[PDB]
């Protein structure tokens, strides 16, 4: 299938309380597989998916050294950005980083990503050409000129076209059915009387992977868009996801309503009913 790898870094300054906290997490598609936390007793990259555990000690050692160095780099970046924006040295600020690769079924790179936000605002991003930058403002243009002079885009491109693609391919080989084969939802409909005249029908999708899903209620096979309560897709805690959709209907008219479920793991789209 088509797949993605992403690293998400968060650095938060705490002036007066020591160096910023740095947290990294890594994902393949919707599966978290590594973490690092600079405030841990002995900070190191740790596994968070079973299939990464087979990587040898040189992997964990190299990655741990990279996060420790990146935490110090982010600390320098936070100091530089509060200078660029003439902000108080007393305040807490956030630097977020998000990078990685999208590959197709053949494992070739479709798209590279390398971008940053400061206090929750886009700051600078590597363009899709992997050769040029988009800067949000005159502060981000200081960063852009520094990175142009340092040939940063070439360092990022080499990673995104090389190690990112090659290591994602490796993870997909080691993760096998857990990453390549979608897990369909377990589905059911529940019925909740509100009064003698109204009841809620709730359509449940549980234990599905990946997170992308569509739940729709239909009345006589027509979508009930404007009348459906849909909760945001939420993690079960076991690497799978949950969602439900609900519609309020007249008591004794439940039989007119069907729930339609679309998920990559289903052999075909499901039609469900209160039964």
């Amino acid at each position: 299938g088509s797949h993605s790898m992403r690293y998400f870094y968060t650095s938060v300054s705490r002036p007066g309380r020591g160096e910023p906290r740095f947290i990294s997490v890594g994902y393949v598609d919707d599966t978290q597989f590594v973490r690092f936390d600079s405030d841990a007793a002995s900070p190191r990259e740790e596994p968070r998916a079973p299939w990464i555990e087979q990587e040898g000690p040189e992997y964990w050692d190299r990655n741990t050294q990279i996060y420790k160095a990146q935490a110090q780099t982010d600390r320098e970046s936070l100091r530089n950005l509060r200078g660029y924006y003439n902000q108080s040295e007393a305040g807490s600020h956030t630097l977020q980083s998000m990078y990685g690769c999208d590959v197709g079924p053949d494992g070739r790179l479709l798209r590279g990503h390398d971008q940053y936000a400061y206090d929750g605002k886009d700051y600078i991003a590597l363009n899709e050409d992997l050769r040029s930058w988009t800067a949000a403002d005159t502060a981000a243009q200081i960063t852009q000129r520094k990175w142009e002079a340092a040939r940063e885009a070439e360092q990022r491109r080499a990673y995104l076209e090389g190690e990112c693609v090659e290591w994602l391919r490796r993870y997909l080989e080691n993760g096998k059915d857990k990453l390549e084969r979608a897990d369909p939802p377990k589905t059911h409909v529940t019925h909740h009387p509100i009064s003698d005249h109204e009841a809620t029908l709730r359509c449940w999708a549980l234990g599905f992977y990946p997170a992308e899903i569509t739940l729709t209620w239909q009345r006589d096979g027509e979508d009930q868009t404007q009348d459906t309560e849909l909760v945001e897709t939420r993690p079960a805690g076991d690497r799978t996801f949950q969602k439900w959709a609900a519609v309020v209907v007249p008591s004794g008219e439940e039989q007119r309503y069907t729930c339609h479920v679309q998920h990559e793991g289903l052999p075909k789209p499901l039609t469900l009913r209160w039964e």
Binding site: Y7, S24, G26, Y59, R62, N63, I66, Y67, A69, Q70, T73, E76, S77, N80, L81, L95, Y99, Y116, Y123, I124, T143, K146, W147, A150, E152, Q155, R156, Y159, E163, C164, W167
Partner: peptide, 9 residues
């Protein structure tokens, strides 16, 4: 695997 760090902003 993560990218090696390079320059600060």
């Amino acid at each position: 695997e993560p990218r090696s760090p390079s320059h600060s902003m």
